[PDB]
Curated annotation (Swiss-Prot), chains A, B:
Outcome (variant: E375A): Decreased catalytic activity and decreased affinity for phosphonoacetaldehyde
UniProt cross-references to PROSITE patterns, sorted A to Z: ALDEHYDE_DEHYDR_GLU (PS00687)
Residues holding NAD(+): T145, P146, F147, K171, P172, T173, E174, S225, E375
Pfam families membership: Aldedh
EC numbers: 1.2.1.-
Gene: phnY
EC category name: oxidoreductase
Record's catalysed reaction(s): phosphonoacetaldehyde + NAD(+) + H2O = phosphonoacetate + NADH + 2 H(+)
Binding site for substrate: R98, H149, R280, C281, T282, R437
Entry annotated with the keyword NAD: yes
Keywords: NAD, Nucleotide-binding, Oxidoreductase, Plasmid
Protein name: Phosphonoacetaldehyde dehydrogenase
Outcome of substituting R98A: Decreased catalytic activity and decreased affinity for phosphonoacetaldehyde
Gene Ontology MF terms: lactaldehyde dehydrogenase (NAD+) activity; nucleotide binding
Length: 474, 474
């Protein structure tokens, strides 16, 4: 399958191609244009020149029709996702489900006007006057999207833009660009004025910088690696920046739990470490288990890990597909091996095959090992034994460069509140994985996980607008 | 008067001095340290290491006590402002009033918790769970303040930081640094833990960059010139930035107005162009008068301009003091002269003396002349005659690089709403000067006027925090 760029509804092709490979067998499944700065430049010019005038009703219609099209075409879309990313169909179908929610909730948010009113006779020198508040769209939005959610991460950037009468230009990663192109087609079909969306593709070295630098761009919204995020922050000079970078999120198991609770916690740990092949910013990447319950906890985790079916992503009975590519998979295995040399205990490792990593279980992981100190973006299930002391646990949890989300399992309210207050993260989930949220709750991290702005449909809609005030004599 | 820096309550001196001059007679009235990078660096380390734990009540107390001290010491504080800036006592006393409002309103905002609650059982794959929202302070805030409001612009940055349990380091301009030092003293006396505030001084070339670049700084808040703002945007890499730059704000006079209304509009025009010696980001800098009413409007403006008393800033009967320095005053006069060569009509110009510029009235100003195309930060009253056509007037109004505030005088609702929707600015005031606002309404511009974030006490408090969410089984 060869797919051209979508520039404001026009199919735009290029001589050189970028090959898209299925990580399961490293075969080419598609091709997209090796687009250049000029292509992004054109897309941005079209975006800047066009002023969306959709009514709130029209926007809701487009967004809800898009959701309906996602539901109707889910098997087809999830096929595209799996073929370029290598996650299981189970995982890619789930992703279509998320994108369906995003477009639905964005559509429903169209009916909301968060305008405020201020009375002005408030101080000795007030006036008989009212100030009113209103939102207007930007000139152009630049959206740069990651490989791990080839559909949903585009949705999270594009739906709020549409809902808010913005024009957006999307550049997906060269590893998984086809899903974005398909979504564009679906949007055009759902009635979106074509000028409001372009999807361009190419090598980072050709077209990447134009996405950061184009003079029409008022806001850059990016999800991806810390390095690339810091690079954007350094070059997107006088522009608003919404940067979501990695996480290194803990699932913390406290020593008040019964054996039944440990089993429930083990269920969360395995699912959390392993969904989407562990490729989530908010994946469980560190299981911090307090020492006194670790001996009962670890076997429960091992047992659940062994139940997971890993293999052919297109097989509907597969739980766990591949990671993004063999190089990533080999790197993750390497960190496991090194952790083991540093004192860790590999409990389950049926062996790696290419980009296919099994849900490896490792106990007694040293917290300073690369495996858990760096972000490891794969289905590793690593247990770090931590002291039966909350202060020390919290300190250890806070000791990485990251601060995105977290999960804490405990039934003791006092301890719950202590962790909620004490963890240095954007989100603390009690009795859920760090990845748990709804599409419209505020989402975003601190430290190296993000520059401190919130995402999610509602906050993104705010980010994508300028507030204008006006006052009238009253 | 020689004043040391205030570094976390400590008086810190330096051998080399920065001389502070009174623009009225160019005499030295004070001296402050020529601080270096190392001084800012120390201030930031102290800020980073300290974690404010004030209760909301305690913060309210400090903030309200500060307001009380501003009121009690207004004559003394306005003296300091006038002596370093050269604005009239009438303007500097007014400034103390604004700062009094800022601290008061910040104090009252302490009782507000804007936390939200989300129910999670919203989609097919919702959970019986609630998400809650909460705010936490940053590590350190860097505040860089302009010469035009030596007190109030420090207040707008510091009060919200206090209200929000943040530590802030302030570097005022070397032109007007003494007011900031005095405010710091007042704050310490009012009970502020000294670690929460430093005021450092020095030449831009010595200590300026450390304010942008220090690794502990989570957020830089700046008000000042477009060039300096763009410089900060270029160097404050992975940091939140709140940048408020200049305005070039219009007061627009529509042709539906009666002669009585023209008189009221003239009052606004003269006050707006002239308050604080015209040295406001939201000063009236362009009076756009529709042609058919210009012949009746202009004489009304002239008459009011001639009533202004300009001269010795310390004389209580002075309306209009000097501008910041003689170089600035000479530049502004030059632009008036050039505008006149290009077809403008100087109607009132009793002559410049040093930094003292009279409220010069100029009619038929070409909209492309430097006088009104550039930001002219002085008490010039420039009337640009515009077509009796709203579309053309709006286009002309939007034709500069700026977009901050605006005022429109008209009684026709349809036209009102057209301008409110059509002006590309952060604020549209109907029948008030562009400068009109309350201290807690959202304030900020677009285009070259600002990077798109809102200021004002309420929005600043939000900017100065990170939102943390947490979820509980429900």
């Amino acid at each position: 399958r060869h797919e051209p760029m979508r520039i404001a509804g026009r199919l735009v092709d290029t001589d050189d191609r970028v090959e898209v490979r299925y990580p399961w067998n490293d075969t080419v499944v598609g091709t997209v244009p090796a687009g250049r700065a000029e292509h992004a430049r054109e897309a941005f010019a079209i975006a800047a020149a066009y002023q969306p005038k959709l009514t709130r009703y029209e926007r809701q219609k487009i967004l809800l029709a898009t959701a309906e099209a996602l539901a109707a075409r889910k098997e087809e879309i999830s096929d595209v996702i799996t073929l370029e990313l290598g996650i299981s169909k189970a995982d890619s179908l789930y992703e279509v489900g998320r994108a369906f929610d995003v477009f639905t909730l964005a559509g429903q948010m169209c009916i909301r006007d968060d305008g405020e009113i201020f009375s002005c006779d408030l101080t000795p020198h007030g006036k008989a006057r009212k100030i009113f508040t209103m939102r207007e769209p930007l000139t152009a939005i630049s959206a740069i999207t990651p490989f791990n959610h080839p559909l949903n991460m585009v949705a999270h950037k594009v739906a709020p833009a549409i809902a808010t009468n913005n024009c957006v230009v999307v550049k997906p990663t060269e590893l998984t660009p086809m899903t974005a192109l398909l979504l564009a087609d679906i949007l055009y079909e759902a009635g979106l004025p074509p000028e409001m969306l372009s999807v361009v593709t190419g090598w980072p070295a050709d077209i990447g910088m134009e996405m950061i630098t184009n003079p029409h761009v008022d806001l850059v919204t990016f999800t991806g690696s810390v390095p690339v995020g810091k690079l954007i922050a350094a070059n997107a000079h006088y522009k608003r920046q919404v940067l979501e970078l990695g996480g290194n999120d803990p699932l913390i198991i406290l020593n008040d739990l019964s054996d039944d609770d440990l089993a429930r916690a083990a269920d969360l740990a395995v699912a959390g470490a392993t969904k989407n092949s562990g490729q989530r910013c908010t994946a469980v990447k560190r299981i911090l288990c307090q020492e006194s319950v670790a001996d009962r906890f670890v076997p429960l985790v091992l047992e659940r890990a062994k139940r997971l079916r890993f293999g052919d992503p297109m097989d509907r009975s597969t739980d766990l597909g591949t990671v993004i590519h063999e190089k990533a998979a080999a790197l993750f295995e390497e960190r496991v091996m090194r952790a083991a040399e540093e004192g860790a205990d590999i409990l389950y490792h049926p062996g790696r095959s290419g980009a296919l990593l099994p849900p490896i279980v490792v106990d007694r992981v040293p917290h300073q090992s690369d495996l858990v100190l760096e972000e490891t973006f794969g289905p590793i299930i690593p247990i770090v034994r931590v002291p039966d002391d909350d202060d020390a646990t919290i300190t250890l949890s806070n000791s990485t460069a990251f601060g995105l989300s977290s999960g804490v399992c405990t039934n003791d309210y006092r301890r719950m509140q202590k962790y909620i207050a004490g963890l240095k993260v954007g989100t603390v989930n009690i009795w859920e994985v760090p990845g748990y949220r709804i599409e419209m709750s505020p989402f975003g991290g601190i430290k190296d996980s993000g520059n401190g702005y919130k995402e999610g449909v509602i906050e993104a809609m705010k980010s994508f607008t300028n507030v204008k005030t006006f006052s009238l004599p009253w």
